[PDB]
């Protein structure tokens, strides 16, 4: 079997980005952020504390025929950003892009996180990281990959983001007039539930590329690129008036500069992302200093290659029994 939906910006900076998809019988379609940071599924509902739901769409197990409690579990996660949600556990039929999984875990949140209920357009994440960070408490669940990939032509989930524009999630096929060249595959390690594996360096602008190993995870749920310090900064030294605010908390720069490119290594292969995609625009409504998409993971703990890289490539994230992620230019 193979699946393929399309996936949306949800606001013009390409904040993140929201694909269809159906739970239950009959389907109620809801609008998830598909996070390979991440491994819950879970979904505003009928038993999300009515205060902390502003214009989402939940699902209602009770309208679905197919809906199945499990009984006593409990879920609660906290993500990067310091947001959160917790609740209790369904399985019910999830379908993505035509592809059909039946007994999918469905986190039921209860309680959300201000910065969720204050986001109408996202109805909640689909995790595409490794089961093993699921928080399905006493019995950890699977993600919806995890339990699609025997299933599927071949154990593999795509990600081909848009800048500014739609792009597509593909399970279970490699799309090969999705990308221009050939796809480099590169090592994953599992060890902490990420897809995590080391680019090969970085150039700035024209400037020659310099190899150096930059560990990192491939997460489509994070909005920018965080990089180390070094790194960093030899970006935002190449444009005219930046510099790091820590008010505004983080790399800010006149929104009329032309902003260079910003290259990474992907073995011997190169994946450029254009100036224009580091743009996030006005710290705030009005203002003429403008948010940079590059910043540095300094205390985060681990580097991220979020959508800001990972929109410039067609990505493979091959679930094979050694897992390796695959990056093209398009």
Sequence with gaps: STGSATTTPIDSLDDAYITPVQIGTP??????????????????????????????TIYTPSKSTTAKLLSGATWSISYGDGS?????????????????????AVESAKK?????????????????????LNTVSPTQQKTFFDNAKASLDSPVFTADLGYH?????????IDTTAYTGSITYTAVSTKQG?????????????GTFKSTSIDGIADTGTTLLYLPATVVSAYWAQVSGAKSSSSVGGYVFPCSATLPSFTFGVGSARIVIPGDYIDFGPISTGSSSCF?????????????????????????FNGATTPTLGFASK
């Design 194 to 206: 990420f897809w995590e594996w080391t680019s090969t360096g970085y150039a700035v602008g024209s």
């Design 112 to 132: 959300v996180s201000s910065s969720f209920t204050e986001d109408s357009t996202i109805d909640g994440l689909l995790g595409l990281a490794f089961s093993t």
């Design 27 to 56: 389907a109620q379609t809801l609008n998830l952020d598909f996070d390979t940071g991440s491994s819950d599924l879970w979904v505003f509902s009928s038993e999300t504390t009515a205060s902390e739901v502003d214009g989402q």
């Design 84 to 104: 959160s949600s917790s609740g209790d556990v369904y399985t019910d039929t999830v379908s993505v892009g035509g592809l059909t999984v039946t007994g999918q």
């Design 165 to 173: 524009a739609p792009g597509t999630y593909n399970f279970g096929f």
């Design 292 to 316: 940079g998409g590059i910043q540095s993971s300094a205390g985060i703990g681990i580097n991220i290659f979020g959508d800001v890289a990972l929109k410039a490539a067609f990505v493979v």
